RNA sequence: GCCCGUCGCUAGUACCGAUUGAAUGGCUUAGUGAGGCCUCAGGAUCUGCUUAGAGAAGGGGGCAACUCCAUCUCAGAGCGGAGAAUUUGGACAAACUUGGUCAUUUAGAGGAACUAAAAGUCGUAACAAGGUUUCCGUAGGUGAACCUGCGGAAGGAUCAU
RNA sequence: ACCCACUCGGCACCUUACGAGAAAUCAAAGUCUUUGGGUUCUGGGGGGAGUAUGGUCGCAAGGCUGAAACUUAAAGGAAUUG
RNA sequence: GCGGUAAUUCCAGCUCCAAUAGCGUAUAUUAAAGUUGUUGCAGUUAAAAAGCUCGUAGUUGAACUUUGGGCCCGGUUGGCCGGUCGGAUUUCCAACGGGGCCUUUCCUUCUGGCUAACCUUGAGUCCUUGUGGCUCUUGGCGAACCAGGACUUUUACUUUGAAAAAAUUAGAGUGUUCAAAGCAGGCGUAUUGCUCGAAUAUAUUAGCAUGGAAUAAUAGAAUAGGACG
RNA sequence: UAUCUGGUUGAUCCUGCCAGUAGUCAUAUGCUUGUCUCAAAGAUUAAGCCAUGCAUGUCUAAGUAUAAGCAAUUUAUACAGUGAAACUGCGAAUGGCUCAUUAAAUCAGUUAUCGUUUAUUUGAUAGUUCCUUUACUACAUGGUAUAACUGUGGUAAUUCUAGAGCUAAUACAUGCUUAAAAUCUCGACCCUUUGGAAGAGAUGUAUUUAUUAGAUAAAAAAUCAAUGUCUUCGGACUCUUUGAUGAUUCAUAAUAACUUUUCGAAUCGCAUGGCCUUGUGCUGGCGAUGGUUCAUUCAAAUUUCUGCCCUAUCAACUUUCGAUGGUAGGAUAGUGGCCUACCAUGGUUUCAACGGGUAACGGGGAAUAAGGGUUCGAUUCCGGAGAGGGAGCCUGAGAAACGGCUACCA
RNA sequence: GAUCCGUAACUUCGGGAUAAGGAUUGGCUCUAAGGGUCGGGUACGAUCAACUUAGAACUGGUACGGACAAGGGGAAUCUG
């Protein structure tokens, strides 16, 4: 199988190293999940000492959390627009960590307009109190708010789908959002 | 897979193979105490040789050294016990000297004769 | 090494789990995290004052120093954010009852809280494996320039 | 080598067992348990080589299966069960009790104790942590884990234990001038009161020790076990009280009583 | 007296050498590529969930209306699971073919050394001013030792006008 | 220019030898079994042989580096008497 | 080196020698070998100083920087005594070591926690005419190391110690009938148990810990871009 | 336990080797051989090839018995004694053997995990599982589908097995449940304050992500946005809680969610007793096997410092097709060029790299005794590697296993 | 053909050499690097015009210097 040993691989002097012993099961590697979008398909893998790992292939939804807003929602994953490791991951809409995706915003909209009584873009007695006690801090942010019109939000994948079988992440904000916004248009 | 059974050889052999003086000196010792072997002389000389070595090394140490006092006295008290070492010279500068016959004289071979009971070393 | 550009990479560089809320307007624009390495090594000001990132930094980063602490003199600064040091020592050959000059080169990471040049004596301490070679991190500088400004022009 | 080693060759066996070279190939391999391999004393050694109660090993199984011997209050049917330092061995038949405790030579001594002393033990807390649901626990040298200990209890402090229940009835802090049993090194078995401790951040704290002949010596902290207050232990000490006479002194003593 | 070389006999060892010579061993290009594993498909059969019918059962509690849970049995329909042969693409990669490379060996007409070796043939080179002092370096020449030219050394046959 | 005395540094000779060496002899070849100031280089019985082989320098002649198998009880140095 | 006709070496007989349940031979290795030389070789003529000088790596490298004097404390041998029922400690003496002081004298350093020790003394005194002697709290020791902050020119060498498998080695104890071994065993009421053991040493380079500050390096303050506050 | 002797000459003193001499846990061979104890032994050459037999299996009162088995007695008409076969569980990764490869590898002493996995032993550890929450969910306990067996068969041939008919579980596959409390979100209403409220849902553990708490370097203040407890309604907040390490984003906890939802006992043996409202109600003794999380123990994997034999007739080597470092990912139990993508041009060397040789496994150690040394270690212990040669993999806690499988080569 | 890799004896050091021996090559769709010109007080902006070279996806009955075009190579002897 794939071997993770250093026993191949010339020494720092550049010297060629003879074969000592054989491939051991414990220095083993395995093949990439190369997980894609839609129609959930997950295969467990038996790892060292019992211990399942969940190799995802084809995930359609994940759990994405708005950091500044202190909430998390489950949304469809629309697509992959940016990846720092390799472009082919984006071309093929492959889900891995640090991938920049686009998700839903309809669940994130619903909660907001319910929580702040505001409605991004462009009656009950108790609710009125809450909304009034709130806002002043309903100000969101420019680059994040203008995205709801699209009905899609930029977010970064914080999980490892070929490992946990989860594709999870966080909405892009602030400086970090700025960074990927620039990258997006200055290549497009 | 067992612990090795340890062993050692009890004799040493003279380098100069033919030395007429040593040979004569050897035969007499045998002919006296009634030994069948030159090895029975060789053995004693080897035992004596290791004793003198221990003694030698102990002497190089400072007087009243803990190792020297302990081990030195033991050597002395062992030697005295069997009757090789005289009571008068107990301090191990004489164990450095000693000599072969002092050991030979203590063999049950000889004691049985020295006491009568035999009236020959060979009858012994 | 670094030398500005900060965000220069393809991936956005950030300290993990250190979060600055955009709703709340702060004056430093970035919340920075750092620790003290231990064993009485001063965590240099440039690490706290700095804008750099370096997840391999013993003061600002995700590694930890434990095990051997060694010193050596800097024989190369060429590779970015890592150096190579020579450690001399004399090896005893009993038969001749004398010694011979020997040396080893030890590759070690250097945070850009430090400005290192060749010739400086430097103190390093052991790491989890950082790279293929580097097993150590630079934790203090015992030299400075080795008298660089004393090389100056005519009187 | 593909997995756990299940055998122990003689001569690879810890020396303080005092087994003989010949008369066999292997030695009993201490089972997994409360104490580390190299520092334990399996029941088969104790019921045979120490107490001479059995001849065969096959008879040591015979004795055990009848639930005679019991360790720290429970029955312990394991032939190779790893009984360690501070443990309490009890024969209800013969009405005998035992606490495993070291020699001056660094060996486990045959040591008879009272009926009531056999109802408690001591252990050194090797760590104290915060467990799940916020419940703090301590762990002692024999592998006991005890929930809800005293907040003042810290690492290296010895602890007195009920044995009829898992509870701690008292504890002793690690301070200058506390009675100490040395477990480790070539000073193993000596008893010295703790002069002072060296710090050395980054590893292996040294601990300075003096018995009363007014003799001094040093071991690593890990090898120090606090047993009490000066002159007063919390358990009954074996004869010789860890004084370590010199080879001459022993020779003098042994030959001091020659009288028939 | 000693003694040098060519030339001749017997025996032995290593060398050079057409054969683009031979053998073993370790790596390896390029081409071909088994197998298990991962993966896109596949669906022998063999059932799950869901929807409706027809024939009986069991009652939440009523004089007629009203009505739940599990279980078996056949026309028919919506949305998933297992799963053999087979099969796509992959990493891993034995092995085969043809080459290259390194290491260790090795045959051979013939050529040309050395030794055993002391002697035999031809001469007399050295040792005596060895009968042309010897010897070094270089050069050319001669059956063979060796001769001769240029420049050295004395270890000369001269410590001396 | 020459004479006398001194003093540095020269090329050498004379007499001694405390000392050294197998001796011939040697103010170093001395201050070494009472064995250590610093440092460079070479040799390890005689032949085989400065040969074979590879590398390298050269126009060439050749230079530098440089083995082995096998053989053999001597080869050799200084001195004494013939 | 023997044997070519009286062979002290062959083939035997006789006799004799050496080792002896063992003794010969072949091959290797070690000692002899100061013929591999650190200890410890040799190089004029015996084997061996490069034709000559330059020269990097390597090895090596003059002298000088707290010495000298004063005071105190307590150790271990050995003497002359023995007080005592083989060993004992005081005072007299030397002798050889350890610690700490004051001499212009960093001991990293402040901020408290601590104090063991006297410049102390608050009383006096068991008792030899008294500085022989220690219990004893109210002005007045830092370092003895705790712990928090703030910082520290680098090495070599040496000391002591921790951490250290067993078997092997050296070696104590023990009469396996001796011995090579083994780790046993030794005492009784030998009718219902008593009991000593299973030591110690070596373990060297490196790493860790501690004492030393000679020897030998390293760094500093000269375009002052110095030092303290 | 600090020794020399023979051989160059006519004789002499040297130089110098050859020869002699002694030991070998050093092999072989020759001759000779009576007793006691002790007892190595197909390593060397061929990690060459193998006939035959044997070397791994395992049951307690306590998982599964309708043997058309035995035994019958002894209370047993569900079972109950003993017990083939088979299922289930566990072991077969230990042991034993060999020394081929291997030269910074292994190995040794010394380190590290704040860089991971760990069957087992030992000690701890679980009141939460259903559902728009009155006509209700099997809990006095839910589902089949199979071996052994019976019967019909195939093949020269094997520890080959096909078709048909049965039946078990601690196998397979499902699935109920239990106190109190508090904090959170919603909010029907009522009434305007300074605002408060009935009752509706959510909250075991594990998984994945984001956020937050986890103070301490010695002391005090003003103001904004929220919003906590106590009113003597201008206002105050007074005591306010802190674990470990040299060092952490540590242990631990809290918020919003996530999951083809981990675990939370449909199990077994002995005993059978209390207690009244007589329901075969409701309780209840000892200990077995399980079970998640943590600890412990047995381990494992990586890992720091320093240390190897001969060689220059090997001086430069390393990036072909990763060489040295950076960022991100992927993969792993996990660190790491372990792999990939992007970027850069690095890494080692006369203090000998790189290459070559080794009739090389490393070590504890062995032989030789003035000392310094020299030579040896296949081989009773430790570590490593292998199972004709390569590669690959299933099972599992643990194997890249060979008395396991698959393929190629021989 | 062309691009890339790789290339022995021997030598007058110029050669031998296209030595030998190998891989690749269509279509389509993208990415990157390579330039001109004008105003700047005594860092950049604005505009226009060119096929080259490398890298990456997709695609086909594995084809692609698709016709045309276009060296067989190696070891020796004699000989100039
Ligand atoms: Mg794949
Ligand atoms: Mg670089
Ligand atoms: Mg066991
Ligand atoms: Mg041919
Ligand atoms: Mg020759
Ligand atoms: Mg002549
Ligand atoms: Mg003549
Ligand atoms: Mg002449
Ligand atoms: Mg003279
Ligand atoms: Mg005769
Ligand atoms: Mg005769
Ligand atoms: Mg002999
Ligand atoms: Mg010396
Ligand atoms: Mg010599
Ligand atoms: Mg000459
Ligand atoms: Mg000469
Ligand atoms: Mg000269
Ligand atoms: Mg030269
Ligand atoms: Mg000097
Ligand atoms: Mg030491
Ligand atoms: Mg002669
Ligand atoms: Mg003669
Ligand atoms: Mg004559
Ligand atoms: Mg000889
Ligand atoms: Mg063999
Ligand atoms: Mg063997
Ligand atoms: Mg075989
Ligand atoms: Mg039955
Ligand atoms: Mg094994
Ligand atoms: Mg079924
Ligand atoms: Mg805290
Ligand atoms: Mg009842
Ligand atoms: Mg060179
Ligand atoms: Mg990287
Ligand atoms: Mg490069
Ligand atoms: Mg070399
Ligand atoms: Mg080998
Ligand atoms: Mg070995
Ligand atoms: Mg060896
Ligand atoms: Mg071998
Ligand atoms: Mg092969
Ligand atoms: Mg295998
Ligand atoms: Mg087999
Ligand atoms: Mg096996
Ligand atoms: Mg050609
Ligand atoms: Mg193409
Ligand atoms: Mg352009
Ligand atoms: Mg022709
Ligand atoms: Mg022509």
UniProtKB/Swiss-Prot annotation, chain A:
Source superkingdom: Eukaryota
Subcellular location: Cytoplasm
Modified sites of kind Phosphoserine: 65, 68, 72, 85, 142-143, 146, 149
UniProt GO molecular function: structural constituent of ribosome
Any coiled-coil regions, as ranges: none
PROSITE patterns reported for this sequence: RIBOSOMAL_S8E
Other noteworthy facts: Present with 15900 molecules/cell in log phase SD medium. There are 2 genes for eS8 in yeast.
Entry-linked NCBIfam families: eS8
Protein name: Small ribosomal subunit protein eS8A
Organism per entry: Saccharomyces cerevisiae (strain ATCC 204508 / S288c)
GN (gene name): RPS8A
Curated annotation (Swiss-Prot), chain B:
Record-level GO BP terms: maturation of SSU-rRNA from tricistronic rRNA transcript (SSU-rRNA, 5.8S rRNA, LSU-rRNA); ribosomal small subunit biogenesis; translation
UniProt keywords, alphabetically: Cytoplasm, Isopeptide bond, Nucleus, Phosphoprotein, Ribonucleoprotein, Ribosomal protein, Ribosome biogenesis, RNA-binding, rRNA processing, rRNA-binding, Ubl conjugation
Predominant localisation class: cytoplasm
Any GO MF annotation of the entry: rRNA binding
Subcellular location: Cytoplasm; Nucleus, Nucleolus
UniProt keyword Ribonucleoprotein, yes or no: yes
Keyword rRNA processing set for record: yes
A GO cellular-component term linked to this record: cytosol
Domain of life: Eukaryota
Subunit structure as annotated in this protein's UniProt entry: Component of the small ribosomal subunit (SSU). Mature yeast ribosomes consist of a small (40S) and a large (60S) subunit. The 40S small subunit contains 1 molecule of ribosomal RNA (18S rRNA) and 33 different proteins (encoded by 57 genes). The large 60S subunit contains 3 rRNA molecules (25S, 5.8S and 5S rRNA) and 46 different proteins (encoded by 81 genes). Interacts with snoRNA U3. uS11 interacts with MPP10. Component of the ribosomal small subunit (SSU) processome composed of at least 40 protein subunits and snoRNA U3.
Misc note: Present with 106000 molecules/cell in log phase SD medium.
Stated family: Belongs to the universal ribosomal protein uS4 family.
Record's protein name: Small ribosomal subunit protein uS4A
Organism in which the protein naturally occurs: Saccharomyces cerevisiae (strain ATCC 204508 / S288c)
Residues of the full protein shown: 2 to 125 of 197
Curated annotation (Swiss-Prot), chain C:
Protein's GO biological process: maturation of SSU-rRNA from tricistronic rRNA transcript (SSU-rRNA, 5.8S rRNA, LSU-rRNA); ribosomal small subunit assembly; translation
PROSITE patterns referenced in this protein's UniProt entry, alphabetically: RIBOSOMAL_S17 (PS00056)
Cross-link (Glycyl lysine isopeptide (Lys-Gly) (interchain with G-Cter in ubiquitin)): 14, 45, 55-56, 78, 95, 104, 132, 140, 147
Native species: Saccharomyces cerevisiae (strain ATCC 204508 / S288c)
Cellular compartment(s): Cytoplasm
Post-translational modification: N-terminally acetylated by acetyltransferase NatA.
Subunit organization: Component of the small ribosomal subunit (SSU). Mature yeast ribosomes consist of a small (40S) and a large (60S) subunit. The 40S small subunit contains 1 molecule of ribosomal RNA (18S rRNA) and 33 different proteins (encoded by 57 genes). The large 60S subunit contains 3 rRNA molecules (25S, 5.8S and 5S rRNA) and 46 different proteins (encoded by 81 genes).
Cross-referenced PANTHER family: 40S RIBOSOMAL PROTEIN S11 FAMILY MEMBER (PTHR10744), 40S RIBOSOMAL PROTEIN S11-RELATED (PTHR10744:SF9)
Coiled-coil region list: none
Name of the protein described by the UniProt record: Small ribosomal subunit protein uS17A
UniProtKB/Swiss-Prot annotation, chain D:
InterPro entries: KOW, Rib_uL2_dom2, Ribosomal_eS4, Ribosomal_eS4_C, Ribosomal_eS4_central_region, Ribosomal_eS4_central_sf, Ribosomal_eS4_KOW, Ribosomal_eS4_N
GO biological process, one term: cytoplasmic translation
S4 RNA-binding domain: residues covered: 41-104
Any matching Pfam family: Ribosomal_S4e
Compartments, as annotated in UniProt: Cytoplasm
Residues making up the signal peptide according to the UniProt record: none
SMART domains tied to this protein: S4
GO MF assignments: RNA binding; rRNA binding; structural constituent of ribosome
Top-level taxon in the UniProt lineage: Eukaryota
Main location: cytoplasm
Gene3D superfamilies: 2.30.30.30, 2.40.50.740, RNA-binding S4 domain (3.10.290.10)
Residues bearing the modification Phosphoserine: 31, 246
Keyword vocabulary terms for this entry: Cytoplasm, Isopeptide bond, Phosphoprotein, Ribonucleoprotein, Ribosomal protein, RNA-binding, rRNA-binding, Ubl conjugation
Cross-link position per record: Glycyl lysine isopeptide (Lys-Gly) (interchain with G-Cter in ubiquitin): 61, 133, 160, 167, 173, 178, 210, 232
Record-listed Phosphothreonine modification sites: 114
Cellular compartments per GO CC: 90S preribosome; cytoplasm; cytosol; cytosolic small ribosomal subunit
Assembly information from the UniProt record: Component of the small ribosomal subunit (SSU). Mature yeast ribosomes consist of a small (40S) and a large (60S) subunit. The 40S small subunit contains 1 molecule of ribosomal RNA (18S rRNA) and 33 different proteins (encoded by 57 genes). The large 60S subunit contains 3 rRNA molecules (25S, 5.8S and 5S rRNA) and 46 different proteins (encoded by 81 genes).
Family to which this protein belongs: Belongs to the eukaryotic ribosomal protein eS4 family.
Record's miscellaneous remark: Present with 573 molecules/cell in log phase SD medium. There are 2 genes for eS4 in yeast.
Name of the molecule in the record: Small ribosomal subunit protein eS4A
Species of origin: Saccharomyces cerevisiae (strain ATCC 204508 / S288c)
Gene designation: RPS4A
